Structures are given as structure tokens and as C-alpha cells.
Design an enzyme around this catalytic site. Sequence first.
Site, PDB file in Angstrom:
ATOM      1  N   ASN A  61       0.863  -1.281  -0.241  1.00 55.73           N
ATOM      2  CA  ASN A  61       0.378   0.161  -0.468  1.00 55.73           C
ATOM      3  C   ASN A  61       0.639   1.633  -0.154  1.00 55.73           C
ATOM      4  OD1 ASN A  61       1.232   0.632   2.496  1.00 55.73           O
ATOM      5  ND2 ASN A  61      -1.033   0.083   3.316  1.00 55.73           N
ATOM      6  N   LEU A  62       2.033   0.879   0.222  1.00 56.07           N
ATOM      7  CA  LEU A  62       2.744   1.704  -0.382  1.00 56.07           C
ATOM      8  C   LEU A  62       3.091   2.625   1.172  1.00 56.07           C
ATOM      9  CD1 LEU A  62       3.044   3.371  -3.830  1.00 56.07           C
ATOM     10  CD2 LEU A  62       4.329   1.226  -2.562  1.00 56.07           C
ATOM     11  N   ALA A 106       5.089  -7.802   4.076  1.00 61.97           N
ATOM     12  CA  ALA A 106       4.146  -5.560   4.935  1.00 61.97           C
ATOM     13  C   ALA A 106       3.954  -6.150   6.199  1.00 61.97           C
ATOM     14  CB  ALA A 106       2.786  -5.984   3.718  1.00 61.97           C
ATOM     15  N   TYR A 139       4.570  -3.977  18.613  1.00 64.47           N
ATOM     16  CA  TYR A 139       5.557  -4.795  17.510  1.00 64.47           C
ATOM     17  C   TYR A 139       5.394  -6.069  17.909  1.00 64.47           C
ATOM     18  CZ  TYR A 139       8.818  -5.479  13.942  1.00 64.47           C
ATOM     19  OH  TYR A 139      10.188  -5.941  12.770  1.00 64.47           O
ATOM     20  N   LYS A 159       3.719  -9.282  16.482  1.00 64.44           N
ATOM     21  CA  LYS A 159       4.143 -10.957  15.533  1.00 64.44           C
ATOM     22  C   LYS A 159       4.311 -11.477  15.946  1.00 64.44           C
ATOM     23  CE  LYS A 159       6.604  -8.437  11.505  1.00 64.44           C
ATOM     24  NZ  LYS A 159       6.221  -8.956  10.578  1.00 64.44           N
ATOM     25  N   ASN A 165      19.343  -6.942  13.042  1.00 65.44           N
ATOM     26  CA  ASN A 165      18.878  -6.542  12.466  1.00 65.44           C
ATOM     27  C   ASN A 165      19.384  -5.918  11.237  1.00 65.44           C
ATOM     28  OD1 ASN A 165      19.183  -5.696  15.286  1.00 65.44           O
ATOM     29  ND2 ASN A 165      18.709  -3.599  14.529  1.00 65.44           N
ATOM     30  N   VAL A 202      19.549   1.674  11.777  1.00 65.35           N
ATOM     31  CA  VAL A 202      21.035   2.822  11.973  1.00 65.35           C
ATOM     32  C   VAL A 202      22.011   3.032  11.110  1.00 65.35           C
ATOM     33  CG1 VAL A 202      21.832   0.845  13.307  1.00 65.35           C
ATOM     34  CG2 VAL A 202      22.671   3.349  13.879  1.00 65.35           C
ATOM     35  N   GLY A 220      13.021   2.629  25.730  1.00 64.61           N
ATOM     36  CA  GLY A 220      12.791   0.696  25.064  1.00 64.61           C
ATOM     37  C   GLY A 220      13.897   0.292  25.135  1.00 64.61           C
TER      38      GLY A 220
HETATM   39  N1  LIG Z   1      14.516  -4.498   8.660  1.00 60.15           N
HETATM   40  C1  LIG Z   1      14.669  -5.168   9.701  1.00 60.15           C
HETATM   41  O1  LIG Z   1      15.324  -4.058  10.552  1.00 60.15           O
HETATM   42  C2  LIG Z   1      13.627  -5.721  10.695  1.00 60.15           C
HETATM   43  C3  LIG Z   1      13.681  -7.090  11.785  1.00 60.15           C
HETATM   44  C4  LIG Z   1      12.932  -7.737  11.994  1.00 60.15           C
HETATM   45  C5  LIG Z   1      11.650  -7.925  11.091  1.00 60.15           C
HETATM   46  N2  LIG Z   1      11.522  -6.836   9.715  1.00 60.15           N
HETATM   47  C6  LIG Z   1      10.482  -7.381   8.937  1.00 60.15           C
HETATM   48  O2  LIG Z   1      10.575  -7.771   7.589  1.00 60.15           O
HETATM   49  C7  LIG Z   1       9.566  -7.547   6.770  1.00 60.15           C
HETATM   50  C8  LIG Z   1       9.932  -6.000   6.178  1.00 60.15           C
HETATM   51  O3  LIG Z   1      10.680  -5.131   6.684  1.00 60.15           O
HETATM   52  P1  LIG Z   1      11.613  -3.983   5.814  1.00 60.15           P
HETATM   53  O4  LIG Z   1      12.471  -3.369   6.854  1.00 60.15           O
HETATM   54  O5  LIG Z   1      11.574  -4.106   4.718  1.00 60.15           O
HETATM   55  O6  LIG Z   1       9.989  -2.815   6.819  1.00 60.15           O
HETATM   56  P2  LIG Z   1       9.687  -1.801   4.816  1.00 60.15           P
HETATM   57  O7  LIG Z   1       8.689  -0.672   5.836  1.00 60.15           O
HETATM   58  O8  LIG Z   1      10.830  -1.737   4.022  1.00 60.15           O
HETATM   59  O9  LIG Z   1       8.789  -3.145   4.198  1.00 60.15           O
HETATM   60  C9  LIG Z   1       7.420  -2.946   4.875  1.00 60.15           C
HETATM   61  C10 LIG Z   1       6.342  -2.879   3.327  1.00 60.15           C
HETATM   62  O10 LIG Z   1       5.189  -3.373   3.773  1.00 60.15           O
HETATM   63  C11 LIG Z   1       4.104  -2.501   2.609  1.00 60.15           C
HETATM   64  N3  LIG Z   1       3.304  -1.961   3.691  1.00 60.15           N
HETATM   65  C12 LIG Z   1       2.868  -1.922   5.112  1.00 60.15           C
HETATM   66  N4  LIG Z   1       1.223  -1.881   5.356  1.00 60.15           N
HETATM   67  C13 LIG Z   1       0.988  -2.232   4.059  1.00 60.15           C
HETATM   68  C14 LIG Z   1      -0.310  -2.834   4.299  1.00 60.15           C
HETATM   69  N5  LIG Z   1      -1.543  -2.948   5.635  1.00 60.15           N
HETATM   70  N6  LIG Z   1      -0.584  -3.939   3.077  1.00 60.15           N
HETATM   71  C15 LIG Z   1      -0.302  -3.062   2.230  1.00 60.15           C
HETATM   72  N7  LIG Z   1       1.425  -3.650   2.548  1.00 60.15           N
HETATM   73  C16 LIG Z   1       1.588  -3.358   3.341  1.00 60.15           C
HETATM   74  C17 LIG Z   1       4.998  -1.012   3.444  1.00 60.15           C
HETATM   75  O11 LIG Z   1       4.689   0.124   2.015  1.00 60.15           O
HETATM   76  C18 LIG Z   1       6.300  -1.785   2.555  1.00 60.15           C
HETATM   77  O12 LIG Z   1       6.753  -1.948   1.173  1.00 60.15           O
HETATM   78  C19 LIG Z   1       8.217  -6.165   7.766  1.00 60.15           C
HETATM   79  O13 LIG Z   1       7.376  -7.989   8.229  1.00 60.15           O
HETATM   80  C20 LIG Z   1       9.286  -6.383   9.231  1.00 60.15           C
HETATM   81  O14 LIG Z   1       8.597  -6.320  10.464  1.00 60.15           O
HETATM   82  C21 LIG Z   1      12.159  -6.288   9.888  1.00 60.15           C
HETATM   83  O1  LIG Z   2      20.323   7.105  14.954  1.00 59.03           O
HETATM   84  C1  LIG Z   2      20.384   6.593  15.430  1.00 59.03           C
HETATM   85  C2  LIG Z   2      19.574   5.637  15.359  1.00 59.03           C
HETATM   86  C3  LIG Z   2      19.589   4.280  16.275  1.00 59.03           C
HETATM   87  N1  LIG Z   2      20.666   4.732  17.182  1.00 59.03           N
HETATM   88  C4  LIG Z   2      21.358   3.971  17.939  1.00 59.03           C
HETATM   89  O2  LIG Z   2      20.746   2.405  16.909  1.00 59.03           O
HETATM   90  C5  LIG Z   2      20.313   1.127  17.497  1.00 59.03           C
HETATM   91  C6  LIG Z   2      19.416  -0.225  16.438  1.00 59.03           C
HETATM   92  O3  LIG Z   2      18.684   0.761  16.188  1.00 59.03           O
HETATM   93  P1  LIG Z   2      17.529   0.736  15.157  1.00 59.03           P
HETATM   94  O4  LIG Z   2      17.995   0.942  13.948  1.00 59.03           O
HETATM   95  O5  LIG Z   2      17.040   1.034  15.066  1.00 59.03           O
HETATM   96  O6  LIG Z   2      17.010  -0.921  15.361  1.00 59.03           O
HETATM   97  P2  LIG Z   2      16.497  -1.322  16.252  1.00 59.03           P
HETATM   98  O7  LIG Z   2      15.970  -0.568  17.582  1.00 59.03           O
HETATM   99  O8  LIG Z   2      17.574  -2.935  16.814  1.00 59.03           O
HETATM  100  O9  LIG Z   2      15.838  -2.375  16.337  1.00 59.03           O
HETATM  101  C7  LIG Z   2      14.967  -3.022  15.217  1.00 59.03           C
HETATM  102  O10 LIG Z   2      15.024  -3.057  13.564  1.00 59.03           O
HETATM  103  C8  LIG Z   2      14.231  -3.404  12.978  1.00 59.03           C
HETATM  104  C9  LIG Z   2      14.336  -1.117  13.139  1.00 59.03           C
HETATM  105  O11 LIG Z   2      14.931  -0.951  12.106  1.00 59.03           O
HETATM  106  C10 LIG Z   2      13.145  -3.770  13.722  1.00 59.03           C
HETATM  107  O12 LIG Z   2      11.776  -3.829  12.857  1.00 59.03           O
HETATM  108  C11 LIG Z   2      13.530  -5.203  14.304  1.00 59.03           C
HETATM  109  O13 LIG Z   2      12.876  -5.643  15.154  1.00 59.03           O
HETATM  110  C12 LIG Z   2      14.144  -4.171  15.597  1.00 59.03           C
HETATM  111  O14 LIG Z   2      15.708  -4.855  15.459  1.00 59.03           O
HETATM  112  C13 LIG Z   2      19.766   1.535  18.907  1.00 59.03           C
HETATM  113  O15 LIG Z   2      20.356   0.663  20.138  1.00 59.03           O
HETATM  114  C14 LIG Z   2      19.702   2.745  18.946  1.00 59.03           C
HETATM  115  O16 LIG Z   2      19.431   3.510  19.902  1.00 59.03           O
HETATM  116  C15 LIG Z   2      21.547   5.253  17.583  1.00 59.03           C
HETATM  117  O17 LIG Z   2      22.154   5.217  18.175  1.00 59.03           O
HETATM  118  N2  LIG Z   2      21.401   5.775  16.968  1.00 59.03           N
END
Ligand SMILES: NC(=O)c1ccc[n+]([C@@H]2O[C@H](COP(=O)([O-])OP(=O)(O)OC[C@H]3O[C@@H](n4cnc5c(N)ncnc54)[C@H](O)[C@@H]3O)[C@@H](O)[C@H]2O)c1
Ligand SMILES: O=c1ccn([C@@H]2O[C@H](COP(=O)(O)OP(=O)(O)O[C@H]3O[C@H](CO)[C@@H](O)[C@H](O)[C@H]3O)[C@@H](O)[C@H]2O)c(=O)[nH]1
Lengths: 309, 308
Positions: free
Chosen positions: B32-33, B74, B143, B147, B172, B186, B269
Amino acid sequence: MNILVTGGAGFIGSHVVDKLIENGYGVIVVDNLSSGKVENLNRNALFYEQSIEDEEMMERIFSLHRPEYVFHLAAQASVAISVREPARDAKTNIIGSLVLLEKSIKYGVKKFIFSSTGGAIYGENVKVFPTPETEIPHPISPYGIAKYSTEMYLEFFAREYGLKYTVLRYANVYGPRQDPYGEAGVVAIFTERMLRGEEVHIFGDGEYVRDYVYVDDVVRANLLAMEKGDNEVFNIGTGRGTTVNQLFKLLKEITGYDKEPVYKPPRKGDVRKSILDYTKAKEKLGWEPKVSLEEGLKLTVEYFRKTLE
Amino acid sequence: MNILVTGGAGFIGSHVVDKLIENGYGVIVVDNLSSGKVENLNRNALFYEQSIEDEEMMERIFSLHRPEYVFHLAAQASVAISVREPARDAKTNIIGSLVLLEKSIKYGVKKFIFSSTGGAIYGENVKVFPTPETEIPHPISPYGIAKYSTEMYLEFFAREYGLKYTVLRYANVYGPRQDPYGEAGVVAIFTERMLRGEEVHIFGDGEYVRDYVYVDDVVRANLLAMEKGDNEVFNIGTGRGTTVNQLFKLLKEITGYDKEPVYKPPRKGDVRKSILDYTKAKEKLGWEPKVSLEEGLKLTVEYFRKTL
Ligand SMILES: NC(=O)c1ccc[n+]([C@@H]2O[C@H](COP(=O)([O-])OP(=O)(O)OC[C@H]3O[C@@H](n4cnc5c(N)ncnc54)[C@H](O)[C@@H]3O)[C@@H](O)[C@H]2O)c1
Ligand SMILES: O=c1ccn([C@@H]2O[C@H](COP(=O)(O)OP(=O)(O)O[C@H]3O[C@H](CO)[C@@H](O)[C@H](O)[C@H]3O)[C@@H](O)[C@H]2O)c(=O)[nH]1
Ligand SMILES: NC(=O)c1ccc[n+]([C@@H]2O[C@H](COP(=O)([O-])OP(=O)(O)OC[C@H]3O[C@@H](n4cnc5c(N)ncnc54)[C@H](O)[C@@H]3O)[C@@H](O)[C@H]2O)c1
Ligand SMILES: O=c1ccn([C@@H]2O[C@H](COP(=O)(O)OP(=O)(O)O[C@H]3O[C@H](CO)[C@@H](O)[C@H](O)[C@H]3O)[C@@H](O)[C@H]2O)c(=O)[nH]1
């Protein structure tokens, strides 16, 4: 003092409303009448025929009345319906709860008292009976998963915003106003069929064990949770197990029914045995059941008799 | 063979789509972007700009295309945002998953591969690192709760209908196409700041430990889960812990950044330490990271330079 009771047109919720009214509280009821009944409503309570997942409507009701306590009994309460329609079930059971919790934080609710489930939460591989709250949950039905998810969200709201809550995990609740029609509990089904001299069905071998707790005792648990048991989860049950076969026998004797039961195939999803340990509720809420199963079944048969006059 | 990828316009999902297309699958994307971008979309995929929680629309999509596999990426995938509107978060994260699963059951999907999370599920008092899947879940953020609820629903669908599934709990994830302007990520934030010579912010003491896993490795785990690991939950991470201070140093060296970090107050958190044990994935999926952190950070910087 204002109190919000969700699901107040339902079986358990309407008894909660009556007791609160009797004790002198201002009571506001939210119920969409999906499974509840207009006849259950208390004329002294303010009634909104509305849905808990309606954000704008919940915003309005909380802003007008700023309830000090919320008793949250509104739910899609049938396990079988949850299996058939899990998204719809979760809309009421999870999303509905979250809307109420958002408004509760915004409008300064002091304490949120949530109706949860013992039977659908502990899962199918329990080894400790009666089962204590220290047993790790493994729900298998959408209903049980939704209830458990909502309990976890409660802990979040407590941590993040300081909302106080109590979770009451009920065993098998029975008594007057339980609907014998539709997706009914076995006590109501057996009682109604027996009084009408109809056929009674027992699923599988009838050796399924449940913990039958009387509705009046569950209501008392809710009220005790107003000032005690902050941020705690409690089993609310009797700690006594009864097989479906034993239950049929008790009700047959009470009703004077003179037919044998008809054994039918086992019902999909039935946990083999459920018995709750209520020691924690006893110690922290001062709660214990006051109505024995035999007393409760008699009261239940008596209410149903009047319906048939 | 048709495949449905939800979240296919997002960071991880767009790479999963690319890899499937490359391997010759027909790919349908639902996104859904809300956080994804049209620029991420593979033009060879069939794209529906629709929401996963829309029952009528998902009915049409599954009925028409009968996907054999669903890759469900998603999500409202960001931990902040989930805190202020948990109901809206759960609508995408739980209800959306449930709609997909109902349609999956109805239209004979063979396997559902769900993207979950390691860190936000294990909670804040873990004592064993790296952390195995046997560690008892205690999510305390909306979150993580959402999940975990979905993982539990997946088991229901498996038991009730024989739907096969695999849960991948990522550590991460970092790499090309991670958005540097959103709430988090980060690696993307540091990289973008450093290349632009802007301030870089380290929250608290910078001693927070995370397990950074490269996106291409995460994509390989998704593909391995098509034929292996039926009805199992797997940590997908590297088993190696990196402090934020260390991440800063590594990226400073690679980018040629010439400033010191600016420290900010700790972010509420943040768990102190997250490191995932990937032994189970190694044994049952045959999965391991192919990209070390240094190598992955260089690829990430490489990509960011090109893209701005
Ligand atoms: N990036 C990480 O570090 C990380 C860590 C643990 C889990 N995950 C999981 O991996 C998956 C992808 O993560 P991501 O980093 O690519 O995030 P992302 O935000 O880039 O990807 C999510 C996509 O889902 C779409 N979306 C959101 N709500 C929607 C809806 N109701 N209907 C249709 N589309 C929808 C968003 O537009 C987006 O394109 C997610 O499930 C996320 O929770 C990611
Ligand atoms: O400008 C910044 C941004 C982040 N952090 C630190 O970087 C670490 C990682 O943070 P972040 O990149 O936000 O990832 P997380 O909060 O660890 O974790 C999420 O990483 C994805 C979101 O980024 C989530 O969906 C995953 O479930 C979870 O691992 C943390 O300790 C933050 O304190 C900084 O110090 N400076
Ligand atoms: N043995 C039991 O009956 C038992 C056991 C364990 C837990 N519980 C729980 O106790 C609570 C009450 O159970 P009950 O037996 O009285 O069932 P009930 O069906 O009679 O009561 C539920 C009420 O909620 C209402 N409702 C449903 N969805 C709603 C919505 N979206 N918005 C507003 N109102 C809605 C219904 O109309 C109904 O009046 C429920 O939370 C249920 O899960 C009951
Ligand atoms: O006509 C009937 C109806 C039921 N049963 C049996 O009776 C037992 C109890 O069934 P039921 O009354 O439906 O209770 P549960 O399925 O245990 O459901 C209880 O547990 C649910 C999940 O915990 C609660 O939350 C419900 O409201 C509560 O009534 C089961 O073994 C059924 O097999 C029969 O044999 N014949």
C-alpha cells in the site's frame, strides 16, 4: 463514580451491570448486540448500542463520561466462530480491546479489568492440575490466541502509561442468562434440551473434564478486582474437574429427564482436560467460589424453567 | 508458478521480489506504499497498490492468481509508531496477516513464509547469547506482541488446515534500499548522514549491542524456506554482536567521515543487547551469512553514494 461495562448486554456482563447498579455506581454500557440481548439490559444503566472497535464512537463515550473503571467483557466469545472467522474474531477481541485501551489512557481510566480465558489459553499439553498461572500459555484456537495477545497488550499499557489492570481467566462459566441457543455452553444446552424432553448429545467418549464456575461467583471476582490484584493475572475457577458424563448425570437427576444421551463424534479442537488453580485469587483477591456445582446447576435449571412457563 | 509477496515495495521485500523474478517465478506484489516506494518495485512483477487487511480485495487477488507461495513481508515494521497507535499497528500486523491466511487456506496456498523479529520477541531480560529459538518469548512492545501473535496464528492455520509455514525472525537487517529518513535503521541513518557530512547522533552511551545481518543473506533464507523448514521458527542473524560505537567507527572509516559523533539522550525502550543464534537455520535450512559485516557495510556505502 462512573463505570464502563463493555458487553453489558451479554450473559456475564449483564450480571456485572446489575451488581454495580445495586451498589450505587453510575454505569455506562457499550454493546453492539451481536450476541447479547435487549432483555438483559438494566433500565438504570446508560446504554450505547455501538461497537468497541469504533474509534470515533468510543472517543465520544469516554470523553463524555470519563469512566474510572472499565470492565471489559465484550468479545466474540464462541471458539467455534473464532475458528471459522479468525480475522473477524480478532477485530473484536484484539482491535476492539486496543481501541478501549487507547481511550482509557487518553481519558484517565484508573483500572481496566479484563475478562480472559483459562481453558483456551493453557493449551492442550498441560501437565499440572489444577493449573496455576505460572504455566506458560500455548493457545491453539483463534479465540485463545486473541485473548492472550490482549493480555500482553495490557502489560504494555501498564508499563508505558501506568494503567492498572487485572486479568481474570475464567474457567467454564454457567448460570442464568447463558444462551442455550447458537454457540452455547454445555450447561445451557443440556438444561434446555432436558426440560423440553429433547435428545441430548455427548461428543466423543464424554470424558472431557472441565471446571464449572457459577456466574455469580465470577461477578464477585470482577468486583474484588477493583481495589485488589493490581497488574496481576488470575484464574477464576473452582479447581474441581467434572466430565461431560458426570455433568449429564447431575442435570438428568435435577431435571427428571428419562432418556440416555446419544454419543456423537468427538468435537474438533476439544482440550482433553481443564481444571484451574484459584489459590492466587484466594490469596490476593480474597476470592473463593461460594456456589457449589450442585447448588449452581439447581439455580440454573430453575431459571430455565421460568423461561418455559 | 505464481508467488505473492506482500510488502514488495519495501526494503527487504523488494529484494525478495528481485530474486524470485531472477529465478523465473511469476510474482504478484501487494503493497500500500505506506512505507514502501514505487522506485523499489520490480517492473516485471504484477503490482496491486492495495492493503493486506482488505478482505474483498485480497479475495480477488488470491482467486485470480492462486499463488502457490506467499512471502509475507508487509508490516507496520517500526517500533516507535506502534506505541502511539497500537490499534492501527495491529490492524496491519495481525488483522492483515489473518486476512492473507484465510485467503491462503481458501485458495490452496502450499506454504506461507512470514517475516518476524528476533529482538522484539525475546524481550528485555535475556541472559543467554547468542539467543536460540528455545528462549521463552516476552514481547513488551506492540510490534513484538503483534509479530508473536501472528506466529501463534500461523500454528493454528497449520493445525486446522495443513497449511505449511516458516517463520523467519530477523536480527537487525541492513543494506541497499533501507530508507535513511524513516524512524529507524541505524546503518542507513549513519551512512546517509556521513556521506552528507551532517551530524551523527549516538543515543545514550552507544554500548547497545545488535546483530547486523545483510539483506542479501536475509533474502537467501526466504528462498531456502520454500522447500525446507516446514512449520518451524528460525532466527536469521549472524551470531555476532556489534556496539553502536563500533558501527560508527566502521562506517566512519569506510565513508571517510571527518567528525566526532554527537551524543543524545538514551532512546526509551532500547534493549541493551540482542544477538541471535542461527544454528537451527544452519542445520535445517542450510543457511548461513555469506556477507561479513565489513563487506556488507562497504556494499551499503557503495550503494548510498550512487543513490543520492
Ligand atoms: N528491517 C529490519 O531490520 C527487520 C527486522 C526484523 C523484522 N523485519 C520485518 O521484515 C518485513 C519487512 O521489513 P522492512 O525493513 O523491509 O520494512 P519496510 O517498511 O520497508 O517494508 C514493509 C512494506 O510493507 C508495506 N505495507 C505496510 N502496511 C501494509 C498494508 N496494510 N498492506 C500492504 N502493504 C503494507 C510498506 O509499504 C512497505 O513497503 C517486515 O515484516 C518487518 O517487520 C524487519
Ligand atoms: O541515529 C541513531 C539511530 C539508532 N541508534 C541506535 O542504534 C541501535 C539500533 O537501532 P535501530 O536501527 O533502530 O534498530 P533497533 O531498534 O534495534 O531494532 C529494530 O530493527 C528494525 C527496525 O529498524 C526492527 O523492525 C527490528 O525488529 C528491530 O531489530 C539502537 O541501539 C539505537 O539506540 C543510534 O544510536 N543513533
Ligand atoms: N464460560 C464463559 O462464558 C466464558 C469463559 C471464559 C471467558 N469468557 C469471557 O467473558 C466475557 C463475556 O462472556 P459471555 O459468556 O457473557 O458471552 P456473551 O456473548 O454473552 O457476551 C459478550 C457480549 O459482547 C457483545 N459484543 C460482542 N462483540 C462486540 C463489539 N465489537 N462491540 C460491543 N459489544 C460486543 C455481545 O453482544 C455480547 O453481549 C467474554 O470476554 C468472554 O470471552 C467467558
Ligand atoms: O452438546 C454438547 C455440548 C458440549 N459438549 C461437550 O461439553 C464440553 C464443554 O463444552 P463447552 O460448553 O462448549 O465448553 P468449552 O468448549 O470448554 O468452552 C469453554 O471454554 C471456552 C474456551 O476456553 C470458554 O472460554 C467458553 O466460553 C467456555 O464455555 C466439551 O467437551 C464438549 O465436547 C457435549 O458433549 N455436548
